[PDB]
C-alpha positions as a Python dict, from the first residue, in 0.01 Angstrom:
ca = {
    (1, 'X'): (0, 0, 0),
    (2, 'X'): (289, 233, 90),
    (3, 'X'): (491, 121, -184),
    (4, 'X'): (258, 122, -436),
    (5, 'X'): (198, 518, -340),
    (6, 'X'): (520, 585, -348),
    (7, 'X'): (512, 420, -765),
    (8, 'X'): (274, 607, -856),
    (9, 'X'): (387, 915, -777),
    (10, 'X'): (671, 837, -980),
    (11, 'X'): (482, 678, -1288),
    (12, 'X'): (255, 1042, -1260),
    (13, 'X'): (580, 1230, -1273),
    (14, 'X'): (689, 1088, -1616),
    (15, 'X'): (327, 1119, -1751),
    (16, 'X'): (326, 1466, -1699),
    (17, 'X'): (700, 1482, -1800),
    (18, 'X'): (607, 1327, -2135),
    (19, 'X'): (325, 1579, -2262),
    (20, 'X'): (535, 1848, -2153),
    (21, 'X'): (790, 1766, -2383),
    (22, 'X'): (602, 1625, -2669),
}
């Protein structure tokens, strides 16, 4: 549960990473 926060936080980050530079 902790972990899995802690993932997707990351996962979100290169999402929003990704439209930003393309």
């Amino acid at each position: 549960f902790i972990h899995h926060i802690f993932r997707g936080i990351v996962h979100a980050g290169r999402s929003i990473g990704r439209f930003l530079t393309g």
